[PDB]
Each structure stands twice: as structure tokens, then as C-alpha cells.
Coordinates of C-alpha atoms in Angstrom, one line a residue:
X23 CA 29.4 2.2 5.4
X24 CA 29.5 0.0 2.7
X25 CA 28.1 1.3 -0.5
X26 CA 28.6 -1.2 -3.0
X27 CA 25.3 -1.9 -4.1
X28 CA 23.5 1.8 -3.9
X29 CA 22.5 3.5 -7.0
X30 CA 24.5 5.7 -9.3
X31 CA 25.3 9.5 -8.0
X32 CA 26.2 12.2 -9.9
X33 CA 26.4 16.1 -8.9
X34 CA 26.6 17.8 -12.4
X35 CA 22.4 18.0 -12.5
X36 CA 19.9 17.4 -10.4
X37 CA 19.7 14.0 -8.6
X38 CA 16.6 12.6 -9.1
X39 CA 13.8 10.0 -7.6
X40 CA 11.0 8.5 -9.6
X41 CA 8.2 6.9 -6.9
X42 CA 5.1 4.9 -9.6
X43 CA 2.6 3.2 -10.9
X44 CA 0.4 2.5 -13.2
X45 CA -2.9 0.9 -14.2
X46 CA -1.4 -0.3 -17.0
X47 CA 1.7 -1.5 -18.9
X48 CA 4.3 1.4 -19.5
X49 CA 4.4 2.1 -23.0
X50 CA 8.2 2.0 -24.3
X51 CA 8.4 5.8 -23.9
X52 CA 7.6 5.2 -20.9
X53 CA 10.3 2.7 -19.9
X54 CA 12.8 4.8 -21.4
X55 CA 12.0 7.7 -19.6
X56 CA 11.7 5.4 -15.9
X57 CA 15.5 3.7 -17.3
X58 CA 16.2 7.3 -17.2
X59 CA 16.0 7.8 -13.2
X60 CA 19.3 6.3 -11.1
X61 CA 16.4 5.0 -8.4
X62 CA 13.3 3.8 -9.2
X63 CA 10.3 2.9 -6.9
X64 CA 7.7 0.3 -8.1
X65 CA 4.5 1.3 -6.2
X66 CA 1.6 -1.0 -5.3
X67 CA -1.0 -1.5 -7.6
X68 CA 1.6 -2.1 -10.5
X69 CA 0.2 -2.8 -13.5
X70 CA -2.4 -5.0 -12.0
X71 CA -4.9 -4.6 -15.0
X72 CA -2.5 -5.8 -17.2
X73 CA -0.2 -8.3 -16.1
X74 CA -3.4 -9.7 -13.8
X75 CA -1.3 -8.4 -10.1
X76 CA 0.6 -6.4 -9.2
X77 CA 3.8 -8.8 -8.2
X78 CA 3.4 -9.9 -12.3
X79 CA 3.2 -6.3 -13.2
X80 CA 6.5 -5.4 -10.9
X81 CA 8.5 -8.3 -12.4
X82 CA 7.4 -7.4 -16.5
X83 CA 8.4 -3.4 -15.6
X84 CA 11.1 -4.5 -14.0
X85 CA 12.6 -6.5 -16.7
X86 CA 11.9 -3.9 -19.0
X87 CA 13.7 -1.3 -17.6
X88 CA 16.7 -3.0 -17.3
X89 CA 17.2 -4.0 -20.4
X90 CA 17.4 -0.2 -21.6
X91 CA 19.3 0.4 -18.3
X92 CA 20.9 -2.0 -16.3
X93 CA 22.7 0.4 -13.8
X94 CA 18.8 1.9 -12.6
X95 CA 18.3 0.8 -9.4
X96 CA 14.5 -0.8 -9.2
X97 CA 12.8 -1.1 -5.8
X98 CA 9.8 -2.8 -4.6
X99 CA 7.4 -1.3 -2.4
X100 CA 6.0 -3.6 0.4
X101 CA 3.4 -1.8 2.9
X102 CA 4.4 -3.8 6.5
X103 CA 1.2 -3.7 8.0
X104 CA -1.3 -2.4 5.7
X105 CA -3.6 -5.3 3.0
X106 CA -4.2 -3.3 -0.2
X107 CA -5.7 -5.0 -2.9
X108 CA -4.2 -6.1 -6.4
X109 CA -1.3 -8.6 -4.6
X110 CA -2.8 -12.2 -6.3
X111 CA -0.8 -14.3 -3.5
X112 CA -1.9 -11.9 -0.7
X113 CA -5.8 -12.3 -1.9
X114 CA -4.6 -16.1 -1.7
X115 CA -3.4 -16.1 1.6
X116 CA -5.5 -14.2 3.6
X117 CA -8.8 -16.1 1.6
X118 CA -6.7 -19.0 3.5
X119 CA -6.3 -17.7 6.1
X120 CA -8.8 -15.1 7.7
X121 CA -6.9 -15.0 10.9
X122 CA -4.3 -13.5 9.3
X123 CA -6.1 -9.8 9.9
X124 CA -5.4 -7.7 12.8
X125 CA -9.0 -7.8 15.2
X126 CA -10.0 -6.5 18.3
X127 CA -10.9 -7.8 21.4
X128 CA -14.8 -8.8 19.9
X129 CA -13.0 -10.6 16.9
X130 CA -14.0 -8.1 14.0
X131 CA -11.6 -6.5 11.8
X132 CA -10.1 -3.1 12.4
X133 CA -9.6 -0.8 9.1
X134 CA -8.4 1.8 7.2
X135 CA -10.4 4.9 7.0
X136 CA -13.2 5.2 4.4
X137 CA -13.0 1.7 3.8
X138 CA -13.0 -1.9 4.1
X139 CA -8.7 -2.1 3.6
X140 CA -7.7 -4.4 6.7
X141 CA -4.4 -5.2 8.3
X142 CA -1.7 -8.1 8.3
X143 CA -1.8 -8.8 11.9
X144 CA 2.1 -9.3 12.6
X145 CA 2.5 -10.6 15.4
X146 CA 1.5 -13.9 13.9
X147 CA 4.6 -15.7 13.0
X148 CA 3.3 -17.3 10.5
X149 CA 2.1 -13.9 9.1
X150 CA 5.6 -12.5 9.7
X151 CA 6.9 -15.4 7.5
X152 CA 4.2 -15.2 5.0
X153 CA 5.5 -11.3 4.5
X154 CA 9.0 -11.9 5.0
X155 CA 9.8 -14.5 2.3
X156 CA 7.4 -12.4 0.0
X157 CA 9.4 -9.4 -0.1
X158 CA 12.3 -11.9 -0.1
X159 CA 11.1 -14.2 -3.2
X160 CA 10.7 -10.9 -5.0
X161 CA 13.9 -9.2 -4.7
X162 CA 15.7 -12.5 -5.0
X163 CA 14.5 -12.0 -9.0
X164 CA 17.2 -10.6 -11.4
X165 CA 15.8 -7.3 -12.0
X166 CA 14.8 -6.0 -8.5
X167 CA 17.3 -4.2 -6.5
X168 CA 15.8 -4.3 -2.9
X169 CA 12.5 -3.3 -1.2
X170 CA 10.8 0.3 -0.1
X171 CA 8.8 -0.7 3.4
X172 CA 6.4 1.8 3.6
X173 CA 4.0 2.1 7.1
X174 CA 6.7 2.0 9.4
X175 CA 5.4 5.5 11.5
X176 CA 1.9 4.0 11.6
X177 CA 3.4 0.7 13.2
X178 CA 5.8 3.6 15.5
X179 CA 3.3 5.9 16.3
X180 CA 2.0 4.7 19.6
X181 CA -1.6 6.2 18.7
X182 CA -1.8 4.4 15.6
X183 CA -2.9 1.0 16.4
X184 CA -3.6 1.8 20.3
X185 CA -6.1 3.0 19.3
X186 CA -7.7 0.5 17.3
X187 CA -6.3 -2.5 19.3
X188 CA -5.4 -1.0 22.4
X189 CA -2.0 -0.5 23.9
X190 CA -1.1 -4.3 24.4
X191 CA -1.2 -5.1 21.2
X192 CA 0.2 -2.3 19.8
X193 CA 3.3 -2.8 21.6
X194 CA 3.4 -6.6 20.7
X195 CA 3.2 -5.2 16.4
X196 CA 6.1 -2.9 17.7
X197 CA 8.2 -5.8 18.7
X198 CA 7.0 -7.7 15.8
X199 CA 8.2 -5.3 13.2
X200 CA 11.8 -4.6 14.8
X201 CA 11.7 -8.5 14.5
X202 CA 11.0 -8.6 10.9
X203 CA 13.4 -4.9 10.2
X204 CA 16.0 -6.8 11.5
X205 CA 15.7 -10.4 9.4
X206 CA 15.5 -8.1 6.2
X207 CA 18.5 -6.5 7.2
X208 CA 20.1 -9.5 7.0
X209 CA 18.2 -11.5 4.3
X210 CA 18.7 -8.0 2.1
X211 CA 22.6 -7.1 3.1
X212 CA 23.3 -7.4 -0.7
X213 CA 20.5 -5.3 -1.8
X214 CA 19.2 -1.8 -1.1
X215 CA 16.6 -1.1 1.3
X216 CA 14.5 2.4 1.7
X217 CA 12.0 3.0 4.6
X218 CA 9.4 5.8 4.8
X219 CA 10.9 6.9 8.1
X220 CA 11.8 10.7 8.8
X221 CA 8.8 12.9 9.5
X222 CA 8.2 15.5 12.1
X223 CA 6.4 13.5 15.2
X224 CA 6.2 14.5 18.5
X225 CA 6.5 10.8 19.4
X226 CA 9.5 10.5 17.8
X227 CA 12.1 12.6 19.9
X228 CA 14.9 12.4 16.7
X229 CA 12.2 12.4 14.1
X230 CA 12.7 9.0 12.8
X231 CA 16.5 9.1 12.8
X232 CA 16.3 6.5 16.2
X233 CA 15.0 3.7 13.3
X234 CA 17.4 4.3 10.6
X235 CA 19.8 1.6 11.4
X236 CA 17.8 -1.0 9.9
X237 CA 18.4 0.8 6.8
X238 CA 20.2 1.8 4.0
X239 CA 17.9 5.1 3.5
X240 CA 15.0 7.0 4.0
X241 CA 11.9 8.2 1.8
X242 CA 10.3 11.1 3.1
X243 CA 6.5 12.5 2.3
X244 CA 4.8 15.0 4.4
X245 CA 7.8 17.0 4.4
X246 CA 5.6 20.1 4.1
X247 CA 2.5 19.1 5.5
X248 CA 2.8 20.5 9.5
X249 CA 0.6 18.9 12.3
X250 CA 0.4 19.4 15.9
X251 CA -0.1 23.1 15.6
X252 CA 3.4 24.0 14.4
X253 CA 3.9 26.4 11.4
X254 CA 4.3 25.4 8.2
X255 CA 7.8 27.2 8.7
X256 CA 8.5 25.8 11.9
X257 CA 7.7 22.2 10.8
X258 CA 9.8 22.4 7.6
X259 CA 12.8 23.7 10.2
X260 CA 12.6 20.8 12.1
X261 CA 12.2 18.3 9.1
X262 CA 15.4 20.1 7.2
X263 CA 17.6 19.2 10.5
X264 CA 16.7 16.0 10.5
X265 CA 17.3 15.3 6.8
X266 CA 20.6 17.0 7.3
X267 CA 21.4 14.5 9.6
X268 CA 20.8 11.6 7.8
X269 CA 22.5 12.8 4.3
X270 CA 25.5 13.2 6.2
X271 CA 25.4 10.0 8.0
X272 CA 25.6 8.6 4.6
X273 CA 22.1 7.4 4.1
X274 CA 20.3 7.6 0.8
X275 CA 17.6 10.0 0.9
X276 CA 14.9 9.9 -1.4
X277 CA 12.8 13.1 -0.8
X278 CA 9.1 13.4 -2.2
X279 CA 7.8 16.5 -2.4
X280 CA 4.1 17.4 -3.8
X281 CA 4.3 20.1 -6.4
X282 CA -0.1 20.6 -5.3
X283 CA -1.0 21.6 -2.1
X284 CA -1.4 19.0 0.9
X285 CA -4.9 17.9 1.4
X286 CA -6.0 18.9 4.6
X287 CA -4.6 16.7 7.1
X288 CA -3.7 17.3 10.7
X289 CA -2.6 13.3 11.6
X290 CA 0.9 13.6 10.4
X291 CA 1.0 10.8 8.7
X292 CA 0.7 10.1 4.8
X293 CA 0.7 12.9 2.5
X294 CA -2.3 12.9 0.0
X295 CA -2.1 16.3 -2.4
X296 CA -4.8 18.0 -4.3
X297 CA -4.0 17.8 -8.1
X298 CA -1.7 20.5 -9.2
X299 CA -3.2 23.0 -10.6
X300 CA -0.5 26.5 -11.3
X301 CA 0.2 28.7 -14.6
X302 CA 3.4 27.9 -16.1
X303 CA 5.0 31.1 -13.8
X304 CA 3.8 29.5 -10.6
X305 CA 4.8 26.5 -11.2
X306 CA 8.5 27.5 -11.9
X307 CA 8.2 29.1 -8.9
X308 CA 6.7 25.9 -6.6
X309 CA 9.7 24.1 -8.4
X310 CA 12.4 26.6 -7.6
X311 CA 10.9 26.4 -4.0
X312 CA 11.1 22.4 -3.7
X313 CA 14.3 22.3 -5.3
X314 CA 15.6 25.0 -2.9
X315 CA 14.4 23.0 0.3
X316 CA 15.8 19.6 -0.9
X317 CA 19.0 21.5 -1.8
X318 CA 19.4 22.8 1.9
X319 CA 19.5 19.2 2.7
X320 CA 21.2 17.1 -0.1
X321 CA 24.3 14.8 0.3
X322 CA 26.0 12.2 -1.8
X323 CA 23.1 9.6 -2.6
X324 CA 20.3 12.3 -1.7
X325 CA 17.8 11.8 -4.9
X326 CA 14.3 14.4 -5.0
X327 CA 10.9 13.9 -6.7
X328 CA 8.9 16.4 -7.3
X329 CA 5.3 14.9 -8.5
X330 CA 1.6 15.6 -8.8
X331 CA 0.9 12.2 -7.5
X332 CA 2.3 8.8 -7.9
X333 CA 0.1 7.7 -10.6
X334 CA 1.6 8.6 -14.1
X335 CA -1.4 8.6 -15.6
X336 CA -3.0 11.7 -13.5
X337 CA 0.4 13.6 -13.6
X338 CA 1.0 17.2 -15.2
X339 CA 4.9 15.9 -14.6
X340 CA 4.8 12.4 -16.0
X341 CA 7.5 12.4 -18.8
X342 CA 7.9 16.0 -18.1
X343 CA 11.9 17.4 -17.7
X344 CA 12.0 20.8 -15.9
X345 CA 14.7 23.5 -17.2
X346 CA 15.5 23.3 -13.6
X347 CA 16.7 19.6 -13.7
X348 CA 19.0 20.0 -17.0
X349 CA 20.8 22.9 -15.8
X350 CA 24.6 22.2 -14.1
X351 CA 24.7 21.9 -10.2
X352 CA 27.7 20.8 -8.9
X353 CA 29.0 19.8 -6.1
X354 CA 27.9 21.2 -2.6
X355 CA 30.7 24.2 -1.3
X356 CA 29.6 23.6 2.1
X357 CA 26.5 23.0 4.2
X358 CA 23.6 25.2 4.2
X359 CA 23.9 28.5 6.3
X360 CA 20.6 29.1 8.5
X361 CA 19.2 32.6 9.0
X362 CA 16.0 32.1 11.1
X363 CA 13.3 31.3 8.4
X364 CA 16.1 31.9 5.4
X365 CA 18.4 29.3 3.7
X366 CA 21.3 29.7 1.7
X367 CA 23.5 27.2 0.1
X368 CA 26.5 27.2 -2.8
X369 CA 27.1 24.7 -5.0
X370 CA 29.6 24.8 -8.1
X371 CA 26.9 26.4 -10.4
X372 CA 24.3 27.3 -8.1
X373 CA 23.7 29.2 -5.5
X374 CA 20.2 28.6 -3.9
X375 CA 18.4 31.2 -1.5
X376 CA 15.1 29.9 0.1
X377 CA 12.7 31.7 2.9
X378 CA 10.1 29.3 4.4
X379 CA 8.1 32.6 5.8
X380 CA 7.4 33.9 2.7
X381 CA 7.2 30.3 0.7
X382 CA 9.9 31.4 -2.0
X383 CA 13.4 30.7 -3.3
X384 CA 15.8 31.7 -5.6
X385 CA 17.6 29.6 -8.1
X386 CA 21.2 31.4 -9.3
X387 CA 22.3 29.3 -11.8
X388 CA 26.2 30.0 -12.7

């Protein structure tokens, strides 16, 4: 593996993520804490009612941050199927070009739930192009580092789309998207790219793993949220294995983790939480927890983020530094030893303890 261009690693604290966005500009505080993180995310919906869009509002935090910190690594999300509003040349392009959103058979446009959010229709070549050079364009800039393609399960979860545009077509976006995967691993060798692609599927018989070649890493969400009538417990075994996998393969992991309990969801897919909402003794004790699971799973390049929601502006956490993230880890000892639903894990100045069937860990700080 070449690593050349991934972000900065250390194991003396905890490694961290940071997954955002704003309305608004950051304020400077605020770019000092993001400079702060060794891997950044840049959300959708960047900015937008400042800088006008969100590719504008990408580019000015992007710039910012790197002039307090030039070795953060800064990514930009791109959704690969889904339209969401605030991109100015996407509103451009698809007020173009209405063919450019998935329809059924009748000709009308399929959608998100609750909603009027539509869908690139990929298989369109001059769609995939459209999509390609935009993620392209805007890591070609000086202060983005690569890309974070998010939707990949709802493009590899047969269901997904079958069922809005039957099984056809949903096989031809398939082939479409390993198309496009594989120009950006190509167009993007130099640069970092993250999918959101581990998560506990029945569909998927190594949980993602089978598509992380395209890849430099993976982001993970759901991680906790269980579907297809498995335990919480049982769901979070089968994720940690996975994840276990990958870190030792060598691929960055970027594990999000919702500090507020999932919002009652049984698709598998996504990972909407309610706002947190703990005293200051529970929430040490859902952060000991988090920490405890990622820590079962961490390797070299493995990065966590603990957050009530990716919108700093609704956060409890924004700017906020736990005790548990200034204290000294050190280096693994050796991998995580399994005891049905129990955990343990040494580290140089930590020894972590966590039990899935009753919800808790312990943190033994050296």
C-alpha cells in the first residue's frame, strides 16, 4: 500500500475524525479548532448561505484551514446518486438538463422519502461525466485533499433502487457506478479517497469489505443502529469484525458514531440520531462506551468521531474536547480479545474493557 498522501497518525491520544457543516461561515475559532483535526470532512450544504453554494463555501473553508494547518487533510463530500440542493452548478445542470433525473417507466421522477429530493440518473454518460469531472474540478484545487463518496450502499443494495426503478435498471446504476469508482481511482491516485462503505447488510456477504478496493478507506455510520432483527449486540459483533478487517488491511477508517440514540430505523441504511440529550455522568459514560468499541477495532490510520449530528451549529460537542481525548493512549499491545458479548484491548496507557450486553465500558487510563 502506498501511503504517501494519507493524513497524519499519531497513537499518543486519541485519533480523531471531524465529519461538517455549516450554514454559515466558520468563525476563526472555528477554523482553528477544524485545522485542529488530522482528517477533515466538508459536508454538503457547506456554507451555502454565505458564500452563495456550497462548492464556494467548500473552497473559502478550505482555504482557511489550511492556512492555520497545512498538514489537515480536507475532503469533499460528493453524494453519487443522490441531488441535494445548495450545489449552484448542479441546480445549473439539471435546470439544463431535466433528463438528467432517474424516472420510471411512466417518465416521472422517483424520490427521496418525505420529499421532492430526486436522483442523478447514472447511467447517462453524459451524467456520469457531468459528476465525474465535478468531483474532479474540485479536488484538483490546492486546498482539497480528495473526495468522501457517500450513497454507495443505496446504489449496492439491490432493494434500493429495484424498487423504485425495477431490477433492470438497477443493475445498469450498479454497472454505472463501478464504472465511475474505478475512473476516480485513477483520476484521484494522488489524492485520498473515503467511501461510506462497511455496514452490516445481509446483501452484502463481507459487509462492504467486497467494495473496498476502489478505495483508500472507509467511513462508517450505523455502526450501532441493528436491522433485520439482529440484536443491538449481535449487529455491533458483526460490524466490529468487519472493521477489524479493514484496519488491518491498511485502510483508513473513519468511524462515526452518534453520541444520541438512533432514530428509529429498520432500513439499514443512513443513520439519523435524536439530539443528545445525557447529564454530564451519562454522557462520560456513552463516551467511554464509543471510545471502547472504536478501540476494539482501531489500526494505524483509524480516526473516530463521536458527534450529536453533523451540523455544528446544533451540536452539544461542537468545539468541545472530552478529558477522554487528551488523555495518553499509546500504541495497541495486540488485537482485541473476544469473550462472547465482552471486549478487552491493551494499549500502552490504556486498557479498555467493553460489554455490548449490558451497553458499558471501562476506560483504565495508565
Amino acid at each position: 500500500i502506498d501511503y504517501s498522501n494519507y493524513p497524519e497518525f499519531s497513537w499518543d491520544t486519541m485519533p480523531l475524525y471531524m465529519h461538517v457543516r455549516k450554514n454559515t461561515a466558520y468563525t476563526d475559532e472555528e477554523i482553528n479548532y477544524l485545522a485542529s483535526f488530522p482528517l477533515i470532512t466538508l459536508e454538503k450544504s457547506q456554507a451555502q448561505n454565505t458564500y452563495g453554494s456550497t462548492e464556494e463555501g467548500t473552497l473559502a473553508t478550505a482555504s482557511a484551514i489550511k492556512l492555520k494547518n497545512n498538514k489537515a487533510k480536507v475532503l469533499y463530500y460528493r453524494n453519487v446518486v443522490i441531488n441535494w440542493g445548495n450545489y449552484k452548478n448542479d441546480d445549473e445542470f439539471i435546470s439544463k438538463n431535466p433528463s438528467a433525473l432517474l424516472k420510471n417507466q411512466n417518465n416521472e421522477l422517483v424520490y427521496m422519502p418525505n420529499g421532492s429530493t430526486p436522483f442523478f440518473d447514472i447511467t447517462k454518460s453524459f451524467v456520469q461525466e457531468y459528476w465525474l469531472k465535478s468531483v474532479e474540478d474540485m479536488v484538483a484545487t490546492p486546498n482539497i485533499d480528495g473526495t468522501f463518496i457517500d450513497a454507495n450502499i443505496k446504489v449496492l443494495v439491490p432493494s434500493f433502487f429495484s424498487s423504485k426503478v425495477g431490477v433492470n435498471k438497477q443493475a445498469e446504476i450498479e454497472n454505472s457506478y463501478f464504472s465511475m469508482m474505478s475512473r476516480l481511482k485513477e483520476s484521484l491516485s494522488n489524492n485520498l479517497i473515503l467511501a461510506n462503505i462497511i455496514r452490516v447488510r445481509p446483501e452484502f456477504e463481507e459487509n462492504g469489505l467486497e467494495y473496498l478496493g476502489y478505495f483508500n478507506g472507509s467511513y462508517l455510520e450505523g455502526f450501532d443502529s441493528e436491522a433485520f432483527g439482529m440484536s443491538n449486540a449481535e449487529y455491533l459483533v458483526e460490524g466490529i469484525e468487519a472493521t477489524q478487517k479493514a484496519a488491518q488491511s491498511g485502510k483508513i477508517i473513519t468511524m462515526t458514531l452518534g453520541l444520541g440514540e438512533a432514530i428509529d430505523n429498520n432500513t439499514g441504511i443512513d443513520d439519523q440520531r435524536e439530539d443528545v440529550d445525557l447529564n454530564d455522568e451519562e454522557l462520560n459514560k456513552r463516551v467511554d462506551y464509543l471510545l471502547a468499541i472504536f478501540l476494539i477495532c482501531a489500526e494505524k490510520y483509524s480516526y473516530v468521531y463521536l458527534h450529536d449530528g453533523y451540523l455544528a451549529t446544533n451540536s452539544a460537542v461542537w468545539l468541545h474536547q472530552f478529558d477522554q481525548y487528551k488523555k495518553a493512549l499509546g500504541a495497541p499491545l495486540g488485537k482485541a480479545i473476544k469473550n462472547g458479548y465482552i471486549y478487552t484491548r491493551k494499549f500502552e496507557n490504556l486498557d479498555v474493557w467493553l460489554n455490548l450486553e449490558t451497553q458499558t465500558a471501562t476506560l483504565t487510563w495508565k
